[PDB]
C-alpha cells in the first residue's frame, strides 16, 4: 500500500547553481504528481557531510514541495555517496522522524559524478534503490558501471543515466507514462 520515499540528492561542487536547481525542481515535480496518495517523502543532501533537508513528519505536516525545500543550501563539496546511502538507512528511515513500519522503503539517488569514498551499503539491503547518473561525468562506460553497485538488481531497471540536466524534465514525463 504505502511507500516511504527518500530523496538523496548530490550537492557537490561540480554542480552549477542552475544544475542544482533543476535537481530540486525534479524532486518537486515528483512530489506534486505523487501527492494525494499513500506516499510520504523525505530529502537528504550529501556531499562531504549529510543533512536531512526535511523528514517524513515534516512532509505530512507541510505537504507543499516548494515550502519544504526553501531553506536548502548548496554544499559545494565532495560526493561521499557511500556514507550517504548509509546515513539514509540508519538515520533517516526512523519512526521518531516519522517513518511508517508498514511501508516499503524506497530511495532515489541523484548524483552527477563518481562516489568520493569507500565502504558498503549492506545496511540498505532492504531499501529499493534508484540511482540516476547526470551528465558529462557519466559519459564513458567505466563510470556508468560504477553506479551499478549503489542500485538494486537488475541494475538494468534501477539505474538511469541522463545526458543533460535538461533531461530530467524528460524522466519526469517517463514516469507519467508508467505503471
Amino acid at each position, epitope marked *: 500500500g504505502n511507500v516511504d520515499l527518500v530523496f538523496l540528492f548530490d550537492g557537490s561542487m561540480s554542480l552549477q*547553481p542552475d544544475e542544482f536547481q533543476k535537481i530540486l*525542481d525534479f524532486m*518537486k515535480d515528483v512530489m506534486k504528481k505523487l501527492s494525494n496518495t499513500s506516499y510520504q517523502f523525505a530529502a537528504v543532501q550529501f556531499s562531504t557531510s549529510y543533512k536531512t533537508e526535511f523528514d517524513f513528519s515534516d512532509y505530512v505536516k507541510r505537504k507543499d514541495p*516548494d*515550502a519544504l525545500l*526553501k531553506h*536548502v*543550501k*548548496h554544499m*559545494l563539496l565532495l560526493t561521499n555517496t557511500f556514507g550517504a546511502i548509509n546515513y539514509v538507512a540508519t538515520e533517516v528511515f526512523r519512526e521518531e522522524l516519522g517513518a511508517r513500519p508498514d511501508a516499503t522503503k524506497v530511495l532515489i539517488i541523484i548524483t552527477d559524478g563518481e562516489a568520493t569514498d569507500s565502504g558498503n551499503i549492506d545496511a540498505a539491503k532492504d531499501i529499493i534503490r534508484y540511482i540516476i547518473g547526470i551528465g558529462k561525468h557519466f559519459q564513458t562506460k567505466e563510470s556508468q558501471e560504477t553506479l551499478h553497485k549503489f542500485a538494486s538488481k537488475p541494475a538494468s531497471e534501477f539505474v538511469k543515466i541522463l545526458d543533460t540536466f535538461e533531461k530530467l524534465k524528460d524522466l519526469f514525463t517517463e514516469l507519467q507514462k508508467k505503471i
Partner: antibody, heavy 121, light 108 residues
Framework: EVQLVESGGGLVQPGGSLRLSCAASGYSFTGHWMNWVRQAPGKGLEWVGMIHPSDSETRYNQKFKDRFTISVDKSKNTLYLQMNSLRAEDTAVYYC??????????????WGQGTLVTVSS | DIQMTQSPSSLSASVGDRVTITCRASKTISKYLAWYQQKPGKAPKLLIYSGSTLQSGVPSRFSGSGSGTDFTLTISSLQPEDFATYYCQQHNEYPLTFGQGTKVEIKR
C-alpha cells in the same frame, strides 16, 4: 525568459501609503525567494526584505519592519510591497529581484527595471 | 551591522586598462561577496558571487578574488560599454548590506 516587471509607484503624501507590485514571468514563482531593494536618488542600495511565494515566510531588514509589510498573490505570480507612513527619505526607486538562497545568505541575480516613489505634499 | 566600504568612490580609465576596485568589509565575511554593475537608469546586473565566481553571461574580463575582509573586482581590459557604477554586497549574514559603489568612467 525570466522577467520581473514592476508597478505601483508615483507621488504619495507624507504619512500616506502605497502598494508596489512585481509581476514575475518565466520561471516557477513558488521556487525562489523574492526580495525588495530600494535606491535613494543617487545613493547606495538598501535591502528591505524577502518573502517566499510558496508560504509567505518573510525576513525583513529591521529598519523597514515597522512600516513596510510584504505579501504575495500566488494566483497572479505577483509580488507586493506595502509601505506606511512614508516620509521624505523614503523617496527612491524600489526594485524587486529574484534571489539565490544557495550560498551564504542571498545574492540577487534577476532584477526588475525599477519603480520611482516620490514622497512629497 | 556590517559596513562595506568601497574604494575609490569613482575613477576614470582608458579603454583597455586593468581596473581594480576594492571593497573592504566591517567584520570578515568568508568568501561571500557579490558584485553588481548598474548602468545609468537600469537595474543592477549581478556579475560575481561568493567572492570570485563568474555568473553565467558575464564576460571573462570581470574577475573577483579575496577573502575575509578585503575583496577586489578586477576589470582586465576595460571597454567602452563597461561604463557604470559598480556595487558590492556581502551575503554571509543579515541584514544584507551593500557598498556605496564606484562610478567607473571611460577616459578618452
Amino acid at each position: 525568459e525570466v522577467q520581473l516587471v514592476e508597478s505601483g509607484g508615483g507621488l504619495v503624501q507624507p504619512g500616506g501609503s502605497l502598494r508596489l507590485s512585481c509581476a514575475a514571468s518565466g520561471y516557477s514563482f513558488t521556487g525562489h525567494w523574492m526580495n525588495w531593494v530600494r535606491q535613494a536618488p543617487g545613493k547606495g542600495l538598501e535591502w528591505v526584505g524577502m518573502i517566499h511565494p510558496s508560504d509567505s515566510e518573510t525576513r525583513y531588514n529591521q529598519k523597514f519592519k515597522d512600516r513596510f509589510t510584504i505579501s504575495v498573490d500566488k494566483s497572479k505570480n505577483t509580488l507586493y510591497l506595502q509601505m506606511n507612513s512614508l516620509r521624505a527619505e523614503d523617496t527612491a526607486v524600489y526594485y524587486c529581484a529574484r534571489g539565490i538562497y544557495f550560498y551564504g545568505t542571498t545574492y540577487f541575480d534577476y532584477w526588475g527595471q525599477g519603480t520611482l516613489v516620490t514622497v512629497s505634499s | 551591522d556590517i559596513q562595506m566600504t568601497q574604494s575609490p568612490s569613482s575613477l576614470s580609465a582608458s579603454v583597455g586598462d586593468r581596473v581594480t576596485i576594492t571593497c573592504r568589509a566591517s567584520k570578515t565575511i568568508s568568501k561571500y561577496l557579490a558584485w553588481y554593475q548598474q548602468k545609468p537608469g537600469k537595474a543592477p546586473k549581478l556579475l560575481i558571487y561568493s567572492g570570485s565566481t563568474l555568473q553565467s553571461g558575464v564576460p571573462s574580463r570581470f574577475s573577483g578574488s579575496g577573502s575575509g575582509t578585503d575583496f577586489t573586482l578586477t576589470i582586465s581590459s576595460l571597454q567602452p560599454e563597461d561604463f557604470a557604477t559598480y556595487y558590492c554586497q556581502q551575503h554571509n549574514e543579515y541584514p544584507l548590506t551593500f557598498g556605496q559603489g564606484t562610478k567607473v568612467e571611460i577616459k578618452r
